[PDB]
Structure formats: structure tokens, C-alpha cells
Amino acid sequence: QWSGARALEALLTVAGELRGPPLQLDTGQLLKIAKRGGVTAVEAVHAWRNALTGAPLNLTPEQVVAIASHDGGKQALETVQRLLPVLCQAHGLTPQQVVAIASHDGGKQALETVQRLLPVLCQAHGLTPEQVVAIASHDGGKQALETVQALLPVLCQAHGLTPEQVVAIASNGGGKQALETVQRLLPVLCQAHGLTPQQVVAIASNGGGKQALETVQRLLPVLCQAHGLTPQQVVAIASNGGGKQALETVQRLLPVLCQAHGLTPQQVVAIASNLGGKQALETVQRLLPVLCQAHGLTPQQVVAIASNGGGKQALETVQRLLPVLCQAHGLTPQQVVAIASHDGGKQALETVQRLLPVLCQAHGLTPEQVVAIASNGGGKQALETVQRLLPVLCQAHGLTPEQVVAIASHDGGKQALETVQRLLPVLCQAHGLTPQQVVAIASNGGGRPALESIVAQLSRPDPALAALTNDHLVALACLGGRPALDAVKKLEH
DNA sequence: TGTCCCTTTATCTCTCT
DNA sequence: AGAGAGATAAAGGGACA
């Protein structure tokens, strides 16, 4: 008999128990833990179900699943119940910060290293606790924290980096590797190739940073003489996760895409210059003639879809869904292109296929409004949030559907909608803002933090902003969101 | 196997003007 | 509004005890 059977049966038995109180986990949550944390993590959750949920830690089940669902999940669960009170009371961290550090492979190691190194990194190295938390909150967080402790001085003194830069480099998975590589390669890339430290940090500050830097050192000469790429173009391609893969693929496919399809080098660089750039390039090479065939999509439009993170997914999804979206739901191909041309274009396309009939018939939106909401990053999330919150926002809060659509139709739309639903009553009732003013603040990228900043200034007034009326604060918040409010505080004092 | 660390890709949100 | 950046997450491989 297959050996995994006994372990599988154990998994399934324990999993069934966890559907009961006090966690009541669903099928998804259960598979998620089993998939990454394994059967030991599933058993640890059950074993420590009571100690985690209520007094003293009071963790949500979502927080328990998030800690459990990684390699060493069992170890992280034990460690959190032990160290969460310590880190909150002895270092002044929030439970949310402790859970964030815990929620990665080897979270035990990160937690214990934070407990050990936070004081010396803050006192002897000048870091804030937030920076230590951010360094800790990735796979290998322990290695990154120890490497920041060791290398912060030589990186700032011998190599000219700021602590912000070092923290930025450290704050990715593999952070130790990127730090050690930047130490070695910063003089090489700057002096031999005329890169600024700022360009080097940008290349370093992603997962696999070590790989991208070494690949830039290796390929920059070939790319910038043979192919005729500029150093700036190479830096842009390198400055994303999978940067090594994107750079090697540009070397491969730049002449192929230009000659076989008449794409420009600038168009190829743009496609390469996203997360998954390698996948996007290879997919364009395969699919462009399939998409463009017989006055179909233009190359221009194919390039546009491809020129976002996960562009491969958007391209394949357009190939799948262009006909049904146009036949059944009556969209123009220009509209499908618009929806596809953002990060997560695949998710947005599939969500439009799924929710266009419902938002139209059940909620009285136009296809144009559904398209407008879908046509931003996180379009799927905004569409699902509009479906969920249109009734309470309209019926209980007095907003028109037009206003809801406007709030929804920006990056972060979901966050803006949920924040309006939350804070509209206190902003209007308690502080006298009009609904239209609240809608205006929320109808921008960064809607959520702009609303939260306003709420904070109205609830716990900072004298630095006191000279501004509510109307002036609204104007500032619409103009530049949270950053503008913060920028204004700094100007005052 | 269980755990830790590293890399790549995809998705979501916010900033910067 | 459209170009950068972090943020979060899934998932695979190397390593080793």
C-alpha cells in the first residue's frame, strides 16, 4: 500500500475536528494549512486550539491559520503563544506585528531573533521597532536580522548607503543574500558601469535580489553594446522580483520580438519590466500572432496587456475570454483590453465574466460602470466589494450608485469602499463633513489612508494642523491624501 | 519528514506629481 | 492618471538533521 495513506487519514480526522469550535475552519483554510504547514501543523492547530483563541492571546482563527500555514507552522504556533506577550509588553510590539513576523516559513526563528536582537538594533544601530519588524517579516527573517546587525556599519560607512536603504534591502526574502551581494557588488556596479547607489539599491530590494545584481553585473555589458539597451533600461528590467529571469529573457527574445513582430526595443523593455517579465515576454512571442490574427487585436494592445505584473496570465485569459465577453456580455474588445491591462488583469477579467450580469441586473449598474470598476489594479476586489456593499452604502448611508462606483474605480477601491462604510457616520455626524466631501476624499488612490488621516485629525487633533479648517483639510486630503496631511505637519514645525 | 532559507511569479494597494 | 514601490501571498528547490 501507498505509504502516505496513514498520514492522509490522520490529516483528514484531525481536520474534521477543527471544523468544530473554537476555530470552525472551512475547507479552504484546512487545505491551506495541510499544503504548507503539513500534517504536523494541522495537529498543532488542534492541540493548541483553546490556548490560542481566547484568553490570554485572543487570536482570530484567521490569525491562527496564517501562522499555521507555513513550513514549521507547528514551531511557529508554540513560539507565538510563548513570545507574543513578551514582544508586546517588553518591546512594545502590537499583536498584529507579532502575527506578521510569525506568518512565514521558520517563523519561530524570526520571532526568537526579534526577541534577541530588537534592543541592540534599536539602541546600538539606530533602527526603529517598525523597521526591525519589517526586516523580520519574511522567510529567513532571522538571517536578515543577523546580517543587518553585522553589516549595517560597513554598508553605511564603507559603501555610503543610508539605514533606510539597508532596511529596504533587508526587507525581502533572501534579505541576507542581497545584503552580502550589495556589499560585494556596489563598488563594481557603480564604478565600472556608472550606476548610482540608488539604482543598485532598487535592484537589490526585491526577493532574489542577489540573483538580479549578479545578473546585472554579468549581462549589462552585452545588453548595452550588442542589443543597444541603455543602462537605465537594464536597471528597470532588473528592479523587479525575478529580475535575473527577466534580464536573461530580454537577452533571448529582444531580437526575436522586434524582427518577427516589429515591436520596438522600448516595447520589449516595458513588457520585461514587471514581476513575471520572463513569462510575459515568452507569452507575447507565442500569442501575439494568435491574438492579432485577421485584424483582431493590435500588437499595440497586446503589448499593453503584457506590460503589467503577471502579464502572462492576462494574455492567456484574454485569449480564452475575448470571444465570450464580446459575444455573451456585449463588450468591445477595446473594453476587454482595458480590463486586462492592469496587475491581476486575469482576476479582473474572470470577475467581470462572473459578475457583469449580476451587477447589471441585480444592482442596476451599466456595463460601462462594471468595466470602469474592473479597469484598475485589484479590479476583482473592487467588483466583489461593490457587489457586497452597494446596498448598505446606498440604503443606509445615503450614497448614490454613481458615488459608490466613483469610490470603487481606483486602485485600492475595495479598501476605500470598506473605509467609507466604516467612517462615514463619524465623519458626518460627529464632525460635520458632508457625504459629498467624504466621497471626494475616498475617490482617489490611497482613499482609505486619506480618510483615516482625516478621522485621526478630527478625533485626536494635532495642533500642527489646527490652523486648517475642516474644509481646508478636506481640500488637502483630496489633493494628496495621507502624505499631504503628513507633509503639512512637517512644514508647520 | 520537518524545518529553515532562497527564488520566482502573481495579485493588491499606496505614493508620487 | 500613469509610472514606481512595498506589501502580501503561493509555490517550488536547496539544505540538513
Q: Calculate the angstrom distance between C1' of C7 and CA of A344.
A: 15
User: Which of A330, A376, A325, A378 has its CA nearest to residue A354?
Assistant: A325
User: Which of A115, A117, A109, A42 has its CA nearest to residue A76?
Assistant: A109
Q: Calculate the angstrom distance between C1' of B12 and CA of A486.
A: 24
- Strand B reaches within 7 A of the A129 CB: no
Record the resolution, in angstroms.
Answer: 1.9
Q: Calculate the angstrom distance between C1' of B1 and CA of A407.
A: 50
- Strand B reaches within 7 A of the A382 CB: yes
- Using the CA of A209, give the nucleotide whose C1' is nearest: B7
Q: Calculate the angstrom distance between C1' of C1 and CA of A49.
A: 48
| CA nearest to nucleotide B13 C1': residue | A412
Burial state string for A400-426 with b = 16 or more CB within 10 A and e = fewer than 16? ebebbbbbbbbbbbbbbbebbbebbee
Amino acid type, A90: A
CA distance A131 to A118: 10
- Strand B reaches within 7 A of the A104 CB: no
- Strand C reaches within 7 A of the A139 CB: yes
Q: Calculate the angstrom distance between C1' of B15 and CA of A236.
A: 18
List Cβ neighbours of A220 (8 Å cut-off, separation of 6 or more).
Answer: A189, A193, A231, A234
- Strand C reaches within 7 A of the A173 CB: yes
- Strand B reaches within 7 A of the A43 CB: no
Are A343 and A349 a contacting pair, CB within 8 Å? no
Positive or negative, the CA dihedral A181, A186, A189, A191 is negative
| CA nearest to nucleotide B11 C1': residue | A344
Amino acid type, A291: L
Q: Calculate the angstrom distance between C1' of B17 and CA of A24.
A: 47
Which of left, alpha, beta for A293 (phi over 0: left; psi -120 to 50: alpha)? beta
What nucleotides of chain C have any atom within 7 angstroms of a protein Cβ? 1-13
Nucleic strand B contact set for A 178-207 (CB, < 7 Å): 178, 206-207
Domain around A250: 1-493
Q: How many residues does chain A have?
A: 493
- Strand B reaches within 7 A of the A91 CB: no
Q: Calculate the angstrom distance between C1' of C15 and CA of A139.
A: 15
What are the C-alpha distances in Å from A24 to residues A8, A40, A61, A99?
20, 19, 8, 20
- Strand B reaches within 7 A of the A175 CB: yes
- Using the CA of A479, give the nucleotide whose C1' is nearest: B17
CA distance A259 to A273: 20
User: Is-cis flag, bond preceding A391, omega within 30?
Assistant: no
Q: Calculate the angstrom distance between C1' of B3 and CA of A66.
A: 17
Cβ neighbour number for residue A265 with a 10 Å cutoff: 17
Q: Calculate the angstrom distance between C1' of B12 and CA of A5.
A: 38
- Strand B reaches within 7 A of the A341 CB: no
List Cβ neighbours of A82 (8 Å cut-off, separation of 6 or more).
Answer: none
CA distance A261 to A259: 6
Q: Calculate the angstrom distance between C1' of B6 and CA of A100.
A: 19
| Number of structural domains found in chain A | 1
What cell numbers appear for A27 in the block?
Answer: 475547507
CA distance A17 to A23: 10
Q: Calculate the angstrom distance between C1' of C11 and CA of A240.
A: 19
CA distance A493 to A477: 19
Q: Calculate the angstrom distance between C1' of C5 and CA of A140.
A: 22
Are A446 and A481 a contacting pair, CB within 8 Å? yes
Please state how this structure was obtained.
X-ray
Amino acid type, A29: Q
CA distance A330 to A328: 6
CA distance A338 to A283: 19
Are A212 and A249 a contacting pair, CB within 8 Å? no
- Strand B reaches within 7 A of the A171 CB: no
